[PDB]
Write a protein that binds this DNA or RNA. Structure first.
Ligand SMILES: [Mg+2]
Ligand SMILES: [Mg+2]
Length: 191
DNA sequence: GCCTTGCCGGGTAAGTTCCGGCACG
DNA sequence: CGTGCCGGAACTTACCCGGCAAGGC
């Protein structure tokens, strides 16, 4: 289905390049944030925001999409308790994603945390359990891969997709038309 | 002789949570 | 008064990038 695919894609971006934040203020006021950050303003406004707006309308979320310009990056932000729990509940059920959602998620995670040269196929993260889930998904998809500690300074692991399966990964996962195409995959397909 | 990939250091593109507003039952 | 949406941005590092070289065929 369309909504679940777009959801899983966004979650990959969120978990990779953003986050889910439950805030308490003096008040005792509060706030619930769904966030994706990115240096490219275009990527946020043109690729990401329209997907998020679609999801917001489909879920009848009344919150608006904020785009905040930071010193080093743009922030796409939705301030919404409803949208926050929607992604947070999805995240704790992540092991139950069907094939379609898995691929959408892996696309999203790769856009966020991946080696964008596509010369090497790598995903970095400190969350080892998250990479190990993605690893099992990939193996099941016929894409071989390994996980090692890539940065001993900060505790950042890397998931390395074997170049032996580069074509399978790029064409059947990054380029699947069952959910939104990541930027470079879309560009390759249109040449 | 060349592809693959573990491992590394460089430094910036990310992430995280604080601030002061306002709305609404 | 209790709580949730706006809009901004200060502050630290978790990523990405790209080089090196061991290993393997
Ligand atoms: Mg990340
Ligand atoms: Mg990124």
């Amino acid at each position: 289905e369309n909504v679940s695919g777009i959801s899983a894609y966004l979650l990959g971006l969120i978990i990779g390049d953003g986050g889910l934040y439950k805030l308490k203020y003096k008040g005792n006021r509060s706030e619930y944030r769904v966030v994706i950050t990115q240096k490219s303003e275009n990527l946020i406004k043109q690729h990401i925001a329209p997907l998020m707006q679609f999801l917001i309308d489909e879920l009848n979320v009344k919150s608006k999409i904020q785009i905040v310009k930071g010193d080093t990056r743009y922030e796409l932000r939705v301030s919404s308790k409803k949208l926050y729990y929607y992604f947070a509940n999805m995240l704790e059920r992540i092991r139950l994603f069907n094939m379609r959602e898995q691929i959408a998620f892996i696309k999203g995670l790769y856009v966020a945390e991946g080696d964008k040269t596509l010369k090497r196929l790598r995903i970095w993260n400190k969350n080892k359990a998250l990479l190990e889930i993605v690893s099992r998904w990939l193996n099941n998809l016929g894409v071989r891969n390994t996980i090692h500690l890539d940065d001993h300074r900060h505790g950042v692991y890397v998931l390395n997709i074997s170049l032996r399966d580069r074509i399978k990964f790029v064409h059947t996962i990054l380029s699947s038309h069952l959910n939104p195409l990541p930027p470079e995959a879309a560009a390759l397909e249109h040449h």
